[PDB]
Amino acid sequence: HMAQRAFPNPYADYNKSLAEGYFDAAGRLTPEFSQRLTNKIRELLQQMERGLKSADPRDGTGYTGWAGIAVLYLHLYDVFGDPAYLQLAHGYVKQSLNCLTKRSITFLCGDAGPLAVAAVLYHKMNNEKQAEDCITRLIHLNKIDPHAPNEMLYGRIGYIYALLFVNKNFGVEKIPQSHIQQICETILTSGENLARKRNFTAKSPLMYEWYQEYYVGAAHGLAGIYYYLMQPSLQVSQGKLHSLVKPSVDYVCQLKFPSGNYPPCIGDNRDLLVHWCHGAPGVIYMLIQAYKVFREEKYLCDAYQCADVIWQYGLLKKGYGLCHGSAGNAYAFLTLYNLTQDMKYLYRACKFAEWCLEYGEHGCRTPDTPFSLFEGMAGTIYFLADLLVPTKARFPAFEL
């Protein structure tokens, strides 16, 4: 059913000859291809700026609203060094800070996005008072909540991301490790408890759910949570890594469809969605991190299969977005490239970029938020700009 959701891939797979137009033998993009990316970035930014005039004033979130546009501009400032991008970021930060709803804790869908992004923006503009005030508020956002989910968009790991985002950008431990540690403990305890209650323990020592479903993928599910639990920056003990996390990862691996794709939820039979939010483009991060941490070939094998699924069925009719679109899917190639150093995957990313350079010429659906970071144009632009230096590229608001 995957074929129904994708355009046929018109591109030939990697060879040295075809790759030479995109990058040199060291994987550095050609000046020509770099400039083509740059030209499209500039073109799309104009469209995005105009389109955002019609966006909902109330939505300040990273996923669909103002803080996500600020994320893009902070990134463009880092990539290009144009002070105008930092100024644009400031404007969007200011909008986002007028939109706090006090309903959610996450970087993507909650108040942590505006606060963390503002902290970084103010820091980059040498505004210590405002930066520090934002950090204080971010730290305070963490309330005791036994019913809070564990996943990326609305749960504990999404709050953790905001903390990591501040620390990374300040280059110092602004938020004490102990804050992250306490949340990590809660996540692990929650997982063990649910697995015990449902008698998953034997096959999976941890289990998580969101809206009463066992989601598998990056956005709402197991792959996102385990990706985080395996991250050195969360400092999960070797004991818990091996006794709890690894067998839980292995359980997810065993859910793989024959195609190499993954079900949205445990028990789902229809092999349909090839998205970051649901399916191989999101699960790949868990597999790659598991390979890095455990060094078992099976994880790398599965990652290759993800890349092949995405190469065949990853050019989505949904559009060019990050959450569920061609640009988000292209990041899967970059993560595998950055692990393997295999230029085949850099090439695949470049070809997906080629597709995005024909933005709007394919008959894709218009997203609900056509200009947002996760549904719309801002995310596509983010990807194009990130591709300029492939080794540093990271799926935004998610990848560490």
Ligand SMILES: N[C@@H](CCC(=O)N[C@@H](CS)C(=O)NCC(=O)O)C(=O)O
């Ligand atoms: N609001 C989205 C459309 C909804 C959507 O695609 N949702 C994702 C999850 S975030 C999905 O996988 N939907 C199920 C499907 O495609 O069947 C947009 O405008 O891009």
Ligand SMILES: [Zn+2]
């Ligand atoms: Zn999605």
